[PDB]
Amino acid sequence: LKLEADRLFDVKNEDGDVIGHALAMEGKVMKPLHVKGTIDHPVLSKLKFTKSSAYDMEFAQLPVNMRSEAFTSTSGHPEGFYNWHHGAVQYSGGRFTIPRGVGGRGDSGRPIMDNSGRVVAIVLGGADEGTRTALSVVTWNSKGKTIKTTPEGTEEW
């Protein structure tokens, strides 16, 4: 059996469709800015969100309590395979890549993470490079600063 904390939340549209996800990580609730909807959570949906347009990110501070049920980011990540909801992701030459036909609407927001459980990046969109989809993500470098990879022809999910 799998018992996993309160970290990934649904973001629904007007009639209720899941159009994206929001995550608890490093003391903040966060979600892609382009995802226009409401976080499906009684406490989280009422918080005041700060807009970070240069990274397609929108974040608010995790309530003192929820602070323990949260992910953790990680700077150092070599090439190789990673994990995500739909299976194995793939860091290769500075860009993550998943098979064609896997990514789609509602997949923006979910984390890509290692085997140790640290979040490497968060998904935003994808540009199809023939047989694999290159991912557009918010990732982070050695001295903290977050980077924002965006492939050519990326259509945000």
DSSP symbols for 14-51: TT--EEEEEEEETTEEEEETT--SEESSTTGGGS-PEE
34, 45, 73, 128: the active-site residue: 34
| Alpha carbon distance 130, 114 (integer Å) | 26
User: Residues for the chain: how many in total?
Assistant: 157
The reply to whether 92 belongs to the active site is: no
21, 56, 107, 136: the active-site residue: 56
**Amino acid occupying residue 20:** G
The reply to whether 108 belongs to the active site is: yes
Contact 99, 132 (CB under 8 A): yes
The reply to whether 34 belongs to the active site is: yes
Contact 31, 41 (CB under 8 A): no
10, 21, 108, 136: the active-site residue: 108
Task: Give the active site residues.
Answer: 34, 56, 108
